[PDB]
Write a protein that holds these residues in place. Sequence first.
Motif, PDB file in Angstrom:
ATOM      1  N   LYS A  36       2.410   9.519  28.277  1.00  0.00           N
ATOM      2  CA  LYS A  36       2.683  10.440  27.179  1.00  0.00           C
ATOM      3  C   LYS A  36       1.580  11.496  27.186  1.00  0.00           C
ATOM      4  N   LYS A  37       1.888  12.661  27.761  1.00  0.00           N
ATOM      5  CA  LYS A  37       0.959  13.777  27.797  1.00  0.00           C
ATOM      6  C   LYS A  37       1.374  14.939  26.910  1.00  0.00           C
ATOM      7  N   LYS A  38       2.660  15.069  26.569  1.00  0.00           N
ATOM      8  CA  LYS A  38       3.106  16.112  25.646  1.00  0.00           C
ATOM      9  C   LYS A  38       4.086  15.520  24.635  1.00  0.00           C
ATOM     10  N   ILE A  39       3.842  15.773  23.345  1.00  0.00           N
ATOM     11  CA  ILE A  39       4.572  15.124  22.254  1.00  0.00           C
ATOM     12  C   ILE A  39       5.139  16.191  21.331  1.00  0.00           C
ATOM     13  N   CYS A  40       6.357  15.965  20.835  1.00  0.00           N
ATOM     14  CA  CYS A  40       6.992  16.844  19.863  1.00  0.00           C
ATOM     15  C   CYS A  40       7.354  16.047  18.617  1.00  0.00           C
ATOM     16  N   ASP A  41       7.038  16.613  17.450  1.00  0.00           N
ATOM     17  CA  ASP A  41       7.305  15.995  16.156  1.00  0.00           C
ATOM     18  C   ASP A  41       8.301  16.885  15.421  1.00  0.00           C
ATOM     19  N   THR A  57      -4.480   9.033  21.013  1.00  0.00           N
ATOM     20  CA  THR A  57      -4.217   9.741  22.257  1.00  0.00           C
ATOM     21  C   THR A  57      -4.783  11.158  22.191  1.00  0.00           C
ATOM     22  N   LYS A  58      -5.005  11.732  23.373  1.00  0.00           N
ATOM     23  CA  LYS A  58      -5.369  13.138  23.517  1.00  0.00           C
ATOM     24  C   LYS A  58      -4.176  14.010  23.891  1.00  0.00           C
ATOM     25  N   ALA A  59      -2.961  13.454  23.881  1.00  0.00           N
ATOM     26  CA  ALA A  59      -1.771  14.230  24.200  1.00  0.00           C
ATOM     27  C   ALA A  59      -1.634  15.423  23.266  1.00  0.00           C
ATOM     28  N   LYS A  60      -1.269  16.568  23.832  1.00  0.00           N
ATOM     29  CA  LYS A  60      -0.973  17.728  23.008  1.00  0.00           C
ATOM     30  C   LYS A  60       0.279  17.460  22.178  1.00  0.00           C
ATOM     31  N   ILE A  61       0.224  17.819  20.898  1.00  0.00           N
ATOM     32  CA  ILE A  61       1.295  17.549  19.947  1.00  0.00           C
ATOM     33  C   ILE A  61       1.769  18.867  19.361  1.00  0.00           C
ATOM     34  N   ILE A  62       3.061  19.155  19.505  1.00  0.00           N
ATOM     35  CA  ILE A  62       3.693  20.332  18.911  1.00  0.00           C
ATOM     36  C   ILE A  62       4.558  19.881  17.745  1.00  0.00           C
ATOM     37  N   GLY A  63       4.235  20.359  16.541  1.00  0.00           N
ATOM     38  CA  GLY A  63       4.971  19.989  15.356  1.00  0.00           C
ATOM     39  C   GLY A  63       5.923  21.102  14.974  1.00  0.00           C
ATOM     40  N   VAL A  64       7.210  20.760  14.844  1.00  0.00           N
ATOM     41  CA  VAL A  64       8.247  21.722  14.482  1.00  0.00           C
ATOM     42  C   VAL A  64       8.559  21.579  13.000  1.00  0.00           C
ATOM     43  N   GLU A  65       8.608  22.703  12.293  1.00  0.00           N
ATOM     44  CA  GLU A  65       8.854  22.695  10.859  1.00  0.00           C
ATOM     45  C   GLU A  65       9.624  23.957  10.497  1.00  0.00           C
ATOM     46  N   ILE A  66      10.677  23.797   9.700  1.00  0.00           N
ATOM     47  CA  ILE A  66      11.568  24.912   9.394  1.00  0.00           C
ATOM     48  C   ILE A  66      11.110  25.697   8.165  1.00  0.00           C
ATOM     49  N   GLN A  67      10.671  25.025   7.095  1.00  0.00           N
ATOM     50  CA  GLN A  67      10.276  25.710   5.868  1.00  0.00           C
ATOM     51  C   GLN A  67       8.858  26.258   5.996  1.00  0.00           C
ATOM     52  N   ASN A  68       8.671  27.509   5.558  1.00  0.00           N
ATOM     53  CA  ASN A  68       7.399  28.175   5.802  1.00  0.00           C
ATOM     54  C   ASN A  68       6.274  27.548   4.994  1.00  0.00           C
ATOM     55  N   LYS A  99      16.386  24.285  22.557  1.00  0.00           N
ATOM     56  CA  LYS A  99      17.022  25.079  23.604  1.00  0.00           C
ATOM     57  C   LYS A  99      15.978  25.841  24.419  1.00  0.00           C
ATOM     58  N   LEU A 100      14.919  26.319  23.771  1.00  0.00           N
ATOM     59  CA  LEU A 100      13.868  27.016  24.503  1.00  0.00           C
ATOM     60  C   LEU A 100      12.833  26.082  25.121  1.00  0.00           C
ATOM     61  N   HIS A 101      12.846  24.783  24.793  1.00  0.00           N
ATOM     62  CA  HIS A 101      11.827  23.868  25.294  1.00  0.00           C
ATOM     63  C   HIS A 101      12.442  22.693  26.045  1.00  0.00           C
ATOM     64  N   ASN A 102      13.517  22.966  26.785  1.00  0.00           N
ATOM     65  CA  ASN A 102      14.262  21.944  27.511  1.00  0.00           C
ATOM     66  C   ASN A 102      13.362  21.194  28.489  1.00  0.00           C
ATOM     67  N   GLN A 103      13.541  19.869  28.528  1.00  0.00           N
ATOM     68  CA  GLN A 103      12.888  18.957  29.471  1.00  0.00           C
ATOM     69  C   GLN A 103      11.374  19.150  29.521  1.00  0.00           C
ATOM     70  N   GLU A 104      10.760  19.283  28.334  1.00  0.00           N
ATOM     71  CA  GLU A 104       9.330  19.553  28.184  1.00  0.00           C
ATOM     72  C   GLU A 104       8.477  18.363  27.724  1.00  0.00           C
ATOM     73  N   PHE A 105       9.022  17.406  26.960  1.00  0.00           N
ATOM     74  CA  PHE A 105       8.206  16.421  26.257  1.00  0.00           C
ATOM     75  C   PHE A 105       8.393  15.013  26.802  1.00  0.00           C
ATOM     76  N   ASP A 106       7.315  14.215  26.711  1.00  0.00           N
ATOM     77  CA  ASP A 106       7.374  12.783  27.017  1.00  0.00           C
ATOM     78  C   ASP A 106       7.819  11.953  25.821  1.00  0.00           C
ATOM     79  N   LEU A 107       7.559  12.438  24.615  1.00  0.00           N
ATOM     80  CA  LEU A 107       7.946  11.742  23.401  1.00  0.00           C
ATOM     81  C   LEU A 107       8.347  12.777  22.355  1.00  0.00           C
ATOM     82  N   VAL A 108       9.503  12.566  21.737  1.00  0.00           N
ATOM     83  CA  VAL A 108       9.905  13.260  20.523  1.00  0.00           C
ATOM     84  C   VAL A 108       9.960  12.218  19.422  1.00  0.00           C
TER      85      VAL A 108
END
Lengths: 212, 212
Positions: A36-41, A57-68, A99-108
Motif C-alpha cells: 500500500k503506497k497510494k491511498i484514496c479516502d 504508514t507513510k503511504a501518500k493519502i488523497i482525501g476526496v470531499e465534495i462539500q467545500n 474517472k481522472l484517477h483510473n488505476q492509481e490507488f492500492d487502497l480506497v
Amino acid sequence: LNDLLGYKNRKLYNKMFNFTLDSVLVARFCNLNSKKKKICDFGTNNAVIPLILSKYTKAKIIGVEIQNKAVEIANENIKLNGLEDQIEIVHADIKEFSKLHNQEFDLVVCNPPILITLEDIIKSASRCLKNKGNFTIVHRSERLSEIINLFYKYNIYPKRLRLIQSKKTDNAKMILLDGIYQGNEGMEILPTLITHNDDETYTDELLKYFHD
Amino acid sequence: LNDLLGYKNRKLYNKMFNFTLDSVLVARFCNLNSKKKKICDFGTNNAVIPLILSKYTKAKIIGVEIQNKAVEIANENIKLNGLEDQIEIVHADIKEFSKLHNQEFDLVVCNPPILITLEDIIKSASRCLKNKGNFTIVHRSERLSEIINLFYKYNIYPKRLRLIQSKKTDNAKMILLDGIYQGNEGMEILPTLITHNDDETYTDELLKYFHD
C-alpha cells in the motif's frame, strides 16, 4: 482544539461520536501492508481517517470531499498536525475524481455520511484501484448483501468481514468489509467486535482502537 | 440406539459430531411461523433436521436424499419416532426433484455434506419455493459472499445472517443464512454464536440448542 482520542501526536478542531467511531474503526480495519503506497479516502471524517491511517504508514493519502466546508476543516486538521506532505485533500465529486484517477490507488477506503449512490461509490472505487487493489468500506449491516452484490458487479471480490455489535445480545448494527479488485473468491470473517459490556461500559476490545 | 442429544421423545440409530451439530443449528435457525405449512430438506442428516424441526411445527416435511443408504437410515429414524405421517423421505436428485415440485414449499433448508454444485442447490431451491418462500442454508464462512451472489442470481433476497465462532477470539468458521424468494432488500444480522468458552467447554448459548 482537542486530542484525537488517545492517539499520540494527533489533534483536531463536533458531529456524532458514533460517526467518528465508525471512522476510527474503518481506519484501524484497513489492511496497511508494504504494497500500500497510494491511498484514496472517499469520505474523510474531517481527515480523522487519514490522521489515523498516517500513524501506521507513510503511504501518500488523497482525501476526496465534495462539500467545500468539509474540505476546509480537513485541510485545517492536516496542517495542524504537520501532515500536508503525506495527506492531500481534493475538492471533487467521487464519480468525476475516479474517472481522472483510473488505476492509481492500492487502497480506497470509504465511510459514507450531485447524488452519490452506493453503487456510484463502489463503481468509482473499481475505477480508482490498480489490479489487485483493495476497497474497504464501513456501513450499516442492513445493506451487507447489497454491498456484496455490487462488489461482484464491478469485479471486487469480498475478502475480510467484521461485524460490530453494541452488546453481546444485540444484532450487529455496522459492518467492516474489504475486497480485492480483480482478485479471487474466498472470504475471511474476523471475530465479531462487541463495543459495550453489559453495564453500558466500553469493552477493552473496542478501547484498544482509541489509541496507538 | 441413543437419545437425540437432550431433545425429548427423539431417538436415532455415527458420522462427525460437528456435522450433526451444524444440522442441529440450522434446524433451530429456521423461521418456523404459521405460514410454513410445507417444508423441503435438501440434505437431511439421517433425518436429524426433520426430527428437530418436527418438535416446533406440524408442517409436512419432505426430505430429499440421493444416496440409497442414507434414505434407509433416515426412514429408520423417522419410523422409530412415529413420525412417518409428517416426514417423508424421497430418494431423488435435487435438480430433478425441484423440476417436478416447482413452487410447492414455504421453506427449503439445506445442510450440504450426479454432481450437485452450490449453484445447483441454490437454483433448485428457487424452483421449489412458492412466492415469498424461505431458503435456509448452513455453510462454511469462506463461501458467504459466493452464496449471497447466487441467492441474488436466482431472486432470493438475503434476510437473516448468523455467524458461528468456536471461540470469542476465532474467525467465524460457519454461517447460518436464509433468504426470501422474490422478496425484498434488507438484511438482519443476529448476535454471533460462540460455541466454546475459553477453557474449551461449551457455552450456555450453544447448549440451549441441545434440548427443546
